Amino acid sequence: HADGSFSDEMNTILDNLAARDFINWLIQTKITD
């Protein structure tokens, strides 16, 4: 927190919407099998 409280969401979009959306959504298909 601080004033806009934007950092928090700005971090979750990376942790949540990147680790599981860089090689686990349009690519694991070409790896698991």
Swiss-Prot record:
Gene induction: Induced in response to nutrient ingestion.
Protein name as annotated: Glucagon-like peptide 2
List of residues that carry Phosphoserine: S5, S7
Role of this protein: Stimulates intestinal growth and up-regulates villus height in the small intestine, concomitant with increased crypt cell proliferation and decreased enterocyte apoptosis. The gastrointestinal tract, from the stomach to the colon is the principal target for GLP-2 action. Plays a key role in nutrient homeostasis, enhancing nutrient assimilation through enhanced gastrointestinal function, as well as increasing nutrient disposal. Stimulates intestinal glucose transport and decreases mucosal permeability.
Gene this protein is translated from: GCG
Organism taxonomic ancestry: Eukaryota, Metazoa, Chordata, Craniata, Vertebrata
Ranges in a coiled coil: none
Organs and tissues of expression: Secreted from enteroendocrine cells throughout the gastrointestinal tract. Also secreted in selected neurons in the brain.
